[PDB]
Write an enzyme that holds these catalytic residues in place. Structure first.
Site, PDB file in Angstrom:
ATOM      1  N   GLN A 154       1.694  43.510  -5.606  1.00 51.45           N
ATOM      2  CA  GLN A 154       0.508  44.224  -5.119  1.00 51.45           C
ATOM      3  C   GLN A 154       0.062  44.825  -3.715  1.00 51.45           C
ATOM      4  O   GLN A 154       0.989  44.791  -2.604  1.00 51.45           O
ATOM      5  CB  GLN A 154      -0.497  43.256  -5.425  1.00 51.45           C
ATOM      6  N   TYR A 184       8.115  -3.669  11.471  1.00 53.57           N
ATOM      7  CA  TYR A 184       8.239  -4.374  10.168  1.00 53.57           C
ATOM      8  C   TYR A 184       9.579  -3.792   9.514  1.00 53.57           C
ATOM      9  O   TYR A 184       9.926  -3.690   9.276  1.00 53.57           O
ATOM     10  CB  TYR A 184       7.517  -4.368   9.950  1.00 53.57           C
ATOM     11  N   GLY A 216       0.163 -12.782   2.710  1.00 54.90           N
ATOM     12  CA  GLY A 216       0.465 -12.392   2.257  1.00 54.90           C
ATOM     13  C   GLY A 216       1.991 -11.828   1.331  1.00 54.90           C
ATOM     14  N   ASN A 248       2.972  -4.774   0.064  1.00 51.75           N
ATOM     15  CA  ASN A 248       3.672  -5.008   1.234  1.00 51.75           C
ATOM     16  C   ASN A 248       4.632  -5.078   1.896  1.00 51.75           C
ATOM     17  O   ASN A 248       5.472  -3.757   1.282  1.00 51.75           O
ATOM     18  CB  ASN A 248       3.537  -6.727   0.643  1.00 51.75           C
TER      19      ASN A 248
END
Ligand code: F43
Ligand code: F43
Ligand SMILES: C[C@@H](OP(=O)(O)O)[C@H](NC(=O)CCCCCCS)C(=O)O
Ligand SMILES: O=S(=O)(O)CCS
Ligand SMILES: O=S(=O)(O)CCS
Ligand SMILES: [Cl-]
Ligand SMILES: [Cl-]
Ligand SMILES: [K+]
Ligand SMILES: [Mg+2]
Ligand SMILES: [Mg+2]
Ligand SMILES: [Mg+2]
Ligand SMILES: [Mg+2]
Ligand SMILES: [Mg+2]
Ligand SMILES: [Mg+2]
Ligand SMILES: [Mg+2]
Ligand SMILES: [Mg+2]
Ligand SMILES: [Mg+2]
Ligand SMILES: [Mg+2]
Ligand SMILES: [Mg+2]
Ligand SMILES: [Mg+2]
Ligand code: NA
Ligand code: NA
Lengths: 248, 442, 548, 548, 56
Positions: free
Chosen positions: D146, D332, D444, D480
């Site tokens: 274009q 972790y 958990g 977890n």
């Protein structure tokens, strides 16, 4: 009941903690007021707050299960649910996290027990919690050097001991005094200072810790050498594995 | 016929209703009362006419704290409820003597709606219940008051909320026990996405009825999911029977024996004794001062253990009259019983695992909440295949008021409407009666 | 007076705006443009550095056979090539979206009740202030309970914080003012009283998570991040057990029961979580824009500031990137916020209405729609016919459709005081335009247009909704440029004419009345101009943790 | 030889690693730490500038009553405080994710069939090269058809490009090599032959969209952006009508029929579109990591590079931000890629297996699981017992559980050559660990752990899946920390031991064998160290378009 | 194979997913049982029938 397999002192101690017919050795005397102070939920002389009205004042419909299950005294009264939380050193504390939760749901009614590596908690109705907490604090569940009452900032289960044999505490709630050889609780479990400290007795000596501990370690009794305990754990793994596949 | 097992069935007072009922008479696939319950839950809607009226009067539509100033409409909906409900019924029914029910409650503030079963016979799923109900009441309100073309879109917003800009009916003033199909964690999960508090509300906190409704919904979902097909079918049927239908009065009798002074541990001891007495387990090997138990019927051991798990929840959370510890019971009943016996725990560890995460997510910062907001479709509590959530329903039935997000808080509209339906409120009664009726056709 | 677009047209072209003819093909293609020249040079450097060809002006067709125009940002005197209004090239535009995406509103009403019932402890301005000190340490990513925590660099997350607001003046005035969005200071008296009455004694947090996190992650991160640090701060500030059953009530409240997301999640075909542009309803977008509280004596200005907000977010970032990408949709959007064109048309319509009916005094009916929307459509189209330079400027039919219909719809709503008849006027404008010029927009422009009239007043399940509640996920609207931002303007229009403090959610309105935001939501078009000039300073940059 | 973690322990603490006692409370709290000191000062500056309190070391509890440790990035000699491994503070970590998020693989097989049939034009290496020149202009956001298009600044989007690969060497060699991922150059001979046989005569694009766009938007943008610019480039390079019926076949092919996303979309509770971390299956993550093609003589190194990749992405960015936020989950994850601890345990296990069975030569059964996972679990736990410094280092039970079980599971898979028995070994490790120390992880941690044994070999609907196909959306795994990246390692382990070129998708493996990526996927841990040192240069910054 | 799952399963289902899910597990189990596919290998049969579900 059997409670736990194995032929070590560790295994026997695990059984003893679970067995409600085993008389927990009482190691120290703590006043009712000092248990309330350590818990830190209310001040001595303060009425038990409530979370709902006494069960008697409620208009409950017929329910056979309710009728058969006697509520604990604090449930009858409408007491709040409150907690006590302990951290246990991996350097041979007498109690340990799963030991506690397993034991608590054998020994105590109406109990919400949680296990974590660095903390273990029971939640129950407040007046009942106070009675349970006395036993948790006075007996061989607790050593004042290698265990700690901690509602926050729990770090220490996995840390090296200090030169006095005390577990690390970020908030220093339990202080060893050389001059008595005794430990004093100087803050409540959430870390607020007590007006007057609470005597927690002498730390257990090395020999007695080894008699009473429920952790397996290479420098104590190793789990791998409690071959009957290992056998049952491996059995449960295999039977679970088979069952998930085809129910055989 | 496929299975030889028979069970004795009791009422919620512990009295015998029918002995020697074939196990498959309790199957969701065969029992006509389970069919009636499931079709009823698909087709039932609670309409809050008062809520619609108030949303309109204030222009508070489209979700929490939303309002469009200048759009207020003051319509006497509750005062004209009889006419509006009758007009809606005409649109909802398929024929005039079908099983469509539209019943006003609370002086016209609420309506119970049961959309005719025939609409679901030619539907893929269950959304026709809220969608047919919603449009029938939108149209009936518009027609009652000759609401203009220019204003009627507010009635629509007051009834069904921000849908379809939102995926859910966000701000709606209708409610169902089911939730929308897009929210399913997996295909087949819809009967699992029913809040525990809704089950407790519908059964008026009757502990055995709440456990029964939850078990019926969970184990029926296990059939829809394919989990109870083939090798697993008998395990799921025995679980339904013994954990949720109090088969052989085993749950009831364990609670009776342990209710006065018992603990999770004392329930375990009684269950192991009973399993041994009944020949479900046997000593396989002697270690040093320790008996290793085995079984020739893992599905039956699982079912007995599941009955003990329910009883342990009733004893532990019943003694506290506080539901929170159900997460602990679900964990340590299973953990303890494995080291007590050498046998696998309920659902081969899956209840215990569910319980670990449920404990975490009901005592931590990260998510979850109180026991009553969980359900079998919740990511935390989906893992056990029907053996965990019914215990949570029992625990919440036994809660005396310790929960902020209680059934009174979350489920009042559900309570008012769905507890009117006898089969929803007292499902143990109807399922046992239907099982007795079809006992000789299995 | 000159039409409002005349200055811009005179800047673009050497001819006067009325002149009908020009000459093409003599500008050197891309070489006429400072910006294209910058791009050509950069492309050569990039390709050499990385060993892969990249931008090359000789690929495909040769840009700039006509004038490559500057654009005036409307309400400013800033003229820039359109590339400087591409969202990729404009840090103000990026930050506007980040500031929305990284915001959630989170009540303290359930939390304070949990404290008072379940735990049995009290709440006051003093305890709230202590909690706010705590959460303003924690929210950017710093610790309050555990030992041996590792933390976010404060300077990387300087844009993250928590404020509160409440309709209770006595509480608002007693909390440390560093933490308070002061409704009485930020809103004119009438609007303040409306807003305070909506909020009442409720207390709400406005939580902004770090831009660097929002950019690394997604919108659905925001309420979770918020809730974690609210939860830690409740534990610390109220001396709670650090993880007891009651902790879960704070989680559920902060994550679900009293959270207001900016956007709701989307269906699978266009799967997205919360706080993405497609989930933001038009009424919220109007409320996010803060023009209403500054420019309230000029309803056109307020409405068109909303249009700018929405055209950029919804067409350039959302439809032009999230839902497509590439070169994208800059000028489909710039048509609605440049050259004072939409402004000219909308002021015409506002005057027509004020003179004939009085604002908000026309009957709310189809007669008004037919009158006003037709009159304003014919005015707008006449301008393209009278000014060949204007038609060459807004060269795409879609751009013209959107601009003309926005003026017609806003003007209709100015007359009726009701957004739904405004929306009907928008669709009538399209139908008239299509017949006048025997064209409208691109191939797929009027999908919603042709469904439009019938769905304005429908009440059916996935058809019927007040305009304020519609958004980019309303089914007919889910795909196409040149509508969504304009609908946000139409949603604003009747409320601006009425003097209403908000369009759809008073909490959303208050939550952006905050000069600690990075983007200045009071002056959206001014900010777009600043970003175009490379003068806007965004948050979230990694310079501190990368080499010199 | 010393245990591999001994150097790190000696660096952290003054005591020898075996020593049981220490002294606390004498380090000055945060003042012991260079990084915390930087943070305290930055917080003061931030708060003063913005007028809202922020980082404050006196809020909540006082960090640093114990030693605040340095961490060795495993396989490097770089020691950093853990804050420098937080994803917010580490531009390498952010770029690793951006490079995945912004990538899709898009076949040219349907597209070329559409060209030859429907358009009736020929495809050759020459036409493919012309197409690739065209799409490398267009893909970063530049125009090819274009007039009056406005475009992205090439230097802001310098990281976006398209390459191809094919298993047919003679065809690959005829395409301009700037655009080709050369399988023979990037992979050792046996792996190259495997990969070329998988691809055959297929031809695949690797499309990378701009980092600045990915950060502004989301992962679900990637395949759309890709497809738009493929579409434009097909129009330009093969001289199509610019929008005819055949155009839609290229769209459908590029968006659906031959696209491979990095991640699949997620269910509503955790709603996300494609190319978000939760959708990336473990086998893909292992294949994205490029350690396999460099370190192939060392299956431990390959496996643990995958663990590092996954622990960071899945625990730090995904679970620690997308699914939560705040301070988050740095350590972790760092437990699995620092201090050479997991390396020590896993080399122990590999050597045990080599000696007893030979790699891949053990029976694939429960006897092998019991043998290997038990032995390796007991070795790892003994190290924490023997070395009090090690236990104080990996102070959280979850960290220890993940590390011990990863070693046990990888070792089991090294023995069997099968990831499913590896997985069974992971769960057995947890069960043994829990009984040995009467603790495992956080509240958990073992949800999936306790469901684990039963679901390893299940075949039921939402239970049964080979490990390679599992990912963060496998139901039990969805919540977890301390599992997902370790599972990616276990997925890699048997394949590394077997010498396989890939774990789950050969196209994904080839697609990241590309030094034009910003992040170096061959050396993930080295890159994390570089980022920690503030030496990594990310893409996507806005410096060019903002004030100096 | 053409499979039509019995109408009675849908009468007590919320929706329609029992068709693929019941069919899939019946054929997974039937294949495992036909060839005595081991516990260690059966998960491949599941993947071959139903694909990447439930990760996808
Ligand atoms: C408040 C909770 C409950 C909860 O929902 N999350 C907490 C806290 C939260 C916060 C703590 C930040 C802060 O201090 O403000 C963060 C960082 C998440 C966040 N919001 O950014 C976190 N935990 Ni926690 N959390 C962790 C851990 C742990 C370990 C710590 C045990 C120990 O002895 O120190 C225990 C669980 C267990 O006992 O196994 C734990 C508990 C807890 N965890 C207890 C607080 C414990 C305390 O009072 O000291 N975490 C770990 O075990 C290691 C990784 C560490 C995470 C940060 C990182 O990965 O770098 C952090 C992850
Ligand atoms: C190839 C298509 C078909 C399709 O699916 N998309 C295209 C092209 C695409 C490309 C063009 C970029 C390039 O040149 O490489 C982009 C920028 C989308 C992208 N991939 O980034 C776009 N269109 Ni189109 N497209 C536009 C428009 C339009 C107008 C232009 C009419 C005129 O007279 O010039 C017409 C439709 C119509 O007739 O109404 C149109 C067509 C078309 N549009 C025809 C090509 C027309 C041609 O051959 O010249 N666009 C517009 O009307 C204005 C906004 C403009 C968009 C860029 C921006 O917003 O800045 C662009 C939006
Ligand atoms: C459970 C669920 O939360 P809700 O109960 O839906 O609020 C879910 N969170 C999580 O799974 C948090 C995972 C990351 C933090 C815990 C890591 S152990 C979520 O936000 O979609
Ligand atoms: O030409 S088309 O209308 O298909 C696209 C306009 S951008
Ligand atoms: O303490 S909890 O296990 O709930 C959270 C650990 S980060
Ligand atoms: Cl505190
Ligand atoms: Cl090597
Ligand atoms: K992003
Ligand atoms: Mg006494
Ligand atoms: Mg010895
Ligand atoms: Mg009428
Ligand atoms: Mg004997
Ligand atoms: Mg001029
Ligand atoms: Mg909701
Ligand atoms: Mg400012
Ligand atoms: Mg040293
Ligand atoms: Mg200060
Ligand atoms: Mg050649
Ligand atoms: Mg090269
Ligand atoms: Mg390199
Ligand atoms: Na060109
Ligand atoms: Na602090």
């Amino acid at each position: 009941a059997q409670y736990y397999p194995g032929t070590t002192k560790v295994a026997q101690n695990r059984r003893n903690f679970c067995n409600p017919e085993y008389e927990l050795e009482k190691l120290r005397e703590i006043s009712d007021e000092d248990v309330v102070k350590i818990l830190g939920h209310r001040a001595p002389g303060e009425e038990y707050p409530s979370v709902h009205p006494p069960l008697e004042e409620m208009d409950e419909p017929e329910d056979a299960i309710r009728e058969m299950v006697e509520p604990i005294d604090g449930a009858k009264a409408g007491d709040r649910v409150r907690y006590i939380q302990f951290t246990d050193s991996m350097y041979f504390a007498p109690a340990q996290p799963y030991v506690r939760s397993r034991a608590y749901l054998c020994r105590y009614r109406g109990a919400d027990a949680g296990t974590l590596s660095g903390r273990q908690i029971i939640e129950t109705r407040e007046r009942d919690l106070e009675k349970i907490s006395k036993e948790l604090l006075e007996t061989e569940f607790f050593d004042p050097a290698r265990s700690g009452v901690r509602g926050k900032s729990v770090h220490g289960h996995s840390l090296r001991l200090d030169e006095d044999g005390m577990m690390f505490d970020m908030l220093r709630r339990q202080i060893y005094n050389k001059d008595t050889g005794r430990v004093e609780m100087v803050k409540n479990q959430i870390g607020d200072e007590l007006d007057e400290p609470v005597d927690l007795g002498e730390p257990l000596d090395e020999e007695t810790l080894m008699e009473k501990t429920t952790i397996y370690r290479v420098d104590g009794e190793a789990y791998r050498d409690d071959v009957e305990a290992v056998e049952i754990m491996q059995r449960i793994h295999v039977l679970r594995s088979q069952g998930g596949f085809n129910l055989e | 016929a496929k299975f030889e097992d028979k069970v004795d069935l009791y009422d919620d007072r512990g009295n015998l209703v029918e002995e020697q009922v074939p196990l498959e008479a309790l199957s969701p696939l065969r029992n006509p009362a389970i069919k009636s319950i499931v079709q009823g839950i698909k087709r039932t809607v609670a309409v809050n006419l008062e809520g619609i009226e108030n949303a309109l009067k204030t222009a508070k539509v489209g979700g929490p704290a939303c309002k469009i100033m200048g759009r207020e409409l003051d319509l006497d909906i509750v005062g004209n409820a009889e006419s509006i409900a009758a007009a809606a019924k005409e649109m909802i029914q398929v024929t005039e003597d079908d099983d469509t029910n539209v019943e006003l409650l609370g002086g016209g503030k609420r309506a119970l709606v049961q959309v005719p079963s025939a609409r679901f016979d030619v539907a893929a799923e269950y959304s026709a219940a809220p969608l047919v109900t919603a449009t029938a009441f939108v149209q009936a309100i518009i027609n009652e008051f000759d609401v203009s073309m220019y204003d009627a879109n507010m009635v629509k917003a007051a009834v069904l909320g921000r849908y379809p800009q939102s995926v859910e009916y966000m701000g709606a003033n209708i409610a169902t026990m089911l939730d929308i199909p897009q929210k399913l964690e997996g295909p087949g999960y819809a009967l699992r996405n029913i809040m525990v508090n809704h089950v407790v509300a519908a059964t008026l906190k009757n502990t055995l009825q709440a456990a029964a409704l939850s078990t019926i919904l969970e184990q029926t979902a296990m059939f829809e999911m394919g989990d109870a097909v083939g090798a697993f079918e008998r395990m799921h049927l025995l679980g339904l029977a013994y954990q949720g239908m109090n088969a052989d009065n085993l749950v009831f009798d364990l609670v009776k024996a342990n209710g006065k002074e018992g603990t999770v541990g004392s329930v375990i001891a009684d269950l192991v004794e009973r399993a041994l007495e009944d020949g479900v387990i046997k000593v396989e090997k002697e270690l040093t001062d320790y008996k290793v138990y085995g079984t020739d019927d893992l599905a039956m051991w699982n079912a007995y253990a599941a009955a003990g798990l329910m009883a342990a929840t009733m004893v532990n959370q019943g003694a506290a009259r506080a539901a929170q510890g159900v997460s602990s019971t679900l964990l340590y009943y299973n953990d303890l019983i494995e080291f007590e016996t050498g046998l696998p725990s309920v659902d081969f560890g899956k209840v215990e695992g569910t319980a670990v995460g449920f404990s975490f997510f009901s005592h931590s910062i990260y998510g979850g909440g109180g026991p009553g907001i969980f359900n079998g479709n919740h990511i935390v509590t989906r893992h056990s295949k029907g053996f965990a959530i019914p215990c949570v329903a029992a625990a919440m039935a036994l809660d005396a008021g310790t929960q902020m997000f209680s059934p009174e808080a979350t489920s009042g509209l559900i309570k008012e409407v769905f507890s009117q339906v006898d089969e929803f409120r007292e499902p143990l009664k109807y399922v046992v009666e239907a099982a007795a009726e079809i006992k000789n056709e299995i | 007076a000159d039409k409002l677009f005349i200055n811009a047209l005179k800047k673009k072209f050497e001819e006067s705006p009325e002149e009908k003819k020009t000459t093409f093909y003599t500008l050197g293609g891309w070489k006429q443009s400072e910006r294209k020249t910058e791009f050509v040079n950069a492309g050569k450097e990039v390709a050499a550095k990385r060993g892969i060809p990249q931008y090359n002006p000789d690929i495909g067709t040769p840009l700039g056979q006509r004038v490559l125009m500057p654009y005036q940002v409307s309400t400013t005197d800033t003229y820039v090539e359109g590339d400087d209004l591409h969202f990729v090239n404009n840090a103000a535009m990026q930050q506007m979206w980040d500031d929305i995406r990284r915001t959630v509103i989170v009540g303290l009403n359930h939390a304070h009740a949990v404290i008072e019932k379940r735990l049995g402890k009290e709440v006051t301005p003093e305890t709230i202030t202590h909690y706010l000190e705590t959460v303003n340490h924690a929210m950017p990513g710093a610790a309050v309970v555990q030992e041996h925590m590792v933390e976010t660099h404060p300077a990387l997350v300087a844009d993250s914080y928590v404020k509160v607001f409440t309709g209770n003046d006595e509480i608002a005035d007693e909390i440390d003012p560093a933490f308070v969005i002061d409704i009485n200071k930020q809103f004119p008296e009438d609007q303040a009283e409306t807003l305070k009455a909506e909020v009442g004694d409720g207390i709400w947090q406005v939580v902004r998570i770090p831009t660097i996190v929002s950019r690394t992650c997604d919108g659905a991160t925001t309420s979770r991040w918020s809730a974690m640090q609210i939860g830690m701060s409740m534990i610390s500030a109220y001396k709670q057990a650090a993880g007891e059953a009651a902790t879960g009530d704070f989680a559920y409240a902060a994550k679900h029961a009293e959270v207001i997301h900016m956007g709701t999640y989307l269906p699978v075909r266009r799967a997205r979580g919360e706080n993405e542009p497609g989930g933001v309803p038009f009424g919220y977008l109007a409320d996010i824009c803060q023009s209403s509280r500054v420019n309230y004596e000029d309803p056109v200005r307020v409405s068109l500031d909303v249009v700018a907000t929405g055209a950029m977010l919804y067409d350039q970032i959302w439809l032009g990137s999230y839902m497509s990408g590439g070169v994208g949709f800059t000028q489909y959007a710039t048509a609605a916020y440049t050259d004072n064109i939409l402004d000219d048309f909308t002021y015409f319509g506002k005057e027509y209405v004020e003179d004939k009916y009085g604002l908000c005094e026309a009957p709310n009916n189809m007669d008004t729609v037919l009158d006003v929307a037709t009159e304003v459509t014919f005015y707008g189209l006449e301008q393209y016919e009278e000014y060949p330079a204007l038609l060459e400027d807004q060269f795409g039919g879609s751009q013209r459709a959107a601009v003309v219909a926005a003026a017609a719809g806003c003007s209709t709503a100015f007359a009726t005081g009701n957004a739904q008849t405004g929306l009907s006027g928008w669709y009538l404008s399209m139908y008239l335009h299509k017949e006048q010029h025997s064209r409208l927009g691109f191939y797929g422009y009027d999908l919603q247009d042709q469904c439009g009239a019938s769905n304005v007043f429908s009440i059916r399940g996935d058809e019927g909704l007040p305009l304020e509640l519609r958004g980019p996920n309303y089914p007919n609207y889910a795909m196409n440029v040149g509508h969504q931002g304009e609908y946000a303007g139409i949603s604003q229009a009747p409320h601006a004419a009425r003097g209403d403090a908000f369009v759809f959610n008073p909490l959303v309105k208050i939550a952006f009345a905050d000069d600690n935001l990075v983007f200045d939501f009071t002056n959206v078009r001014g900010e777009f101009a600043k970003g175009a000039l490379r003068e806007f300073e965004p948050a979230g940059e990694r310079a501190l943790i990368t080499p010199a």
